[PDB]
Design goal:
Number of helices: 17
Membrane topology: Multi-pass membrane protein
Main location: membrane
Keywords: Membrane, Plasmid, Transmembrane, Transmembrane helix
Largest sheet: none
Structural class: mainly alpha
Organism: Deinococcus geothermalis (strain DSM 11300 / CIP 105573 / AG-3a)
Protein name: Sulphate transporter
Length: about 375
């Protein structure tokens, strides 16, 4: 059976840390995808749980990332936050289908140009998503986001193994509350969780015509999620040692997303950064991810009235730096076609504000170049 409970002392702690790092991610990504923070937090929780029990690679955090959100942001403003639920259920179904058929090894065939393009487009789309918080501008917004970047970039050279983003959020919250600053707070953008996720059958989609409109986004969500899970897995593999079956990982991902969709949640996948922060801080057990999700839920339920008071400048700063962390690649001075693919995805996503379209043209372009090679 090979199932363990080794190193609880470090796993629990690591889970706590990455949970504290997980809250603002889910809230923000929820706002970016035009939906309530509740959906993102729920998603992170239940996904972390189910992956903790059925995941392939232990110590890998699967919660809620922009890589999923920016693919649903178009589905929510055209059909609603609930066609999203259907799409997440179907996504999980496609993932357990992908795992049952044992097709993970084919993920290598996916062009690097398409992937790097996806990453770039993703990041700059994050940065662009932070812009509608500046169109209605009070100088408190500017001052607190600038001081946010400042404290995030200048404090950690003096401090230790505790996030500068944590200090940023806490300090800016305390300030905004005490000084009574006039700025938008998170509680305005959407409702925050006040109870446990209840079984919400997607009462909002209807069979076939729904299928015809959620199948593409479920496909892209599934593929992106399995890619993310694959690379995150392999990086944890390199960091330590494992013979992790990526098929089992894909299945766990699938089931997770399925029940997530059945409990009023978003779509989720593996998170590189938080998995790395986890393994670096001593997390290498399933209890790490479990405690991540659980302590996430407990803490967001605990700080709820304080949570809704958190100023939007702090979170827009955190997103502002997560974008920067995501984008920067090797801007090479190389195959013209591949560069063409990356820049195509980037430019198309930038112009249309649709990540799915960038992915689509990436796929078809890579296919054309392939036909030209073959």
């Amino acid at each position: 059976q090979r199932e363990w409970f080794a190193n609880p002392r470090k796993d629990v702690l690591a889970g706590i840390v990455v949970a504290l790092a997980l809250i603002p991610e889910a809230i923000a990504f929820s706002i970016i995808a035009g939906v309530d923070p509740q959906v993102g937090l729920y998603a992170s929780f239940i996904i972390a749980l189910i992956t903790a029990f059925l995941g392939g690679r232990p110590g890998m955090i699967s919660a809620a990332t922009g890589a999923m959100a920016l693919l649903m942001t178009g589905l929510v403003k055209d059909h609603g936050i609930q066609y999203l639920f259907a799409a997440t259920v179907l996504t999980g179904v496609l993932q357990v289908v992908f795992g049952w058929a044992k097709l993970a090894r084919y993920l290598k065939f996916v062009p690097r140009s398409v992937m790097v393009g996806f990453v770039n487009a993703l990041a700059i789309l994050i940065f662009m998503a932070q812009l509608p918080q500046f169109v209605g501008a009070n100088w408190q917004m500017y001052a607190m986001v600038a001081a946010g970047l400042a404290i995030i970039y200048l404090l950690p050279l003096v401090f230790k193994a505790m996030p500068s983003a944590l200090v940023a959020i806490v300090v800016l919250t305390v300030v905004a509350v005490v000084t009574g600053a006039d700025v938008k707070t998170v509680g305005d953008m959407g409702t925050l969780p006040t109870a446990l996720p209840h079984f919400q059958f997607p009462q909002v989609p209807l069979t076939f015509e729904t299928l015809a409109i959620i199948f593409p986004v479920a496909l892209t969500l599934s593929l992106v999620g399995l890619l993310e899970s694959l690379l995150t897995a392999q990086l944890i593999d390199e960091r330590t040692d494992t013979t992790s079956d990526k098929n089992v990982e894909s299945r766990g991902q699938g089931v997770a997303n399925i029940v997530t969709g059945f409990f009023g949640g978003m779509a989720g996948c593996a998170m590189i950064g938080q998995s790395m922060i986890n393994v670096t801080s001593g997390g290498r057990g399933r209890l790490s991810t479990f405690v991540a999700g659980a302590f996430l839920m407990v803490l967001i339920l605990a700080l709820q009235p304080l949570l809704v008071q958190i100023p939007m400048a702090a979170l827009v700063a955190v997103m502002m730096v997560v974008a920067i962390s995501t984008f920067d690649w090797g801007s090479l001075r190389f195959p013209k076609g591949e560069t063409v693919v990356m820049l195509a995805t980037v430019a198309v996503t930038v112009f249309t504000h649709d990540l799915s379209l960038g992915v689509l043209i990436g796929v078809v372009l890579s296919a054309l170049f392939f036909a030209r090679k073959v």
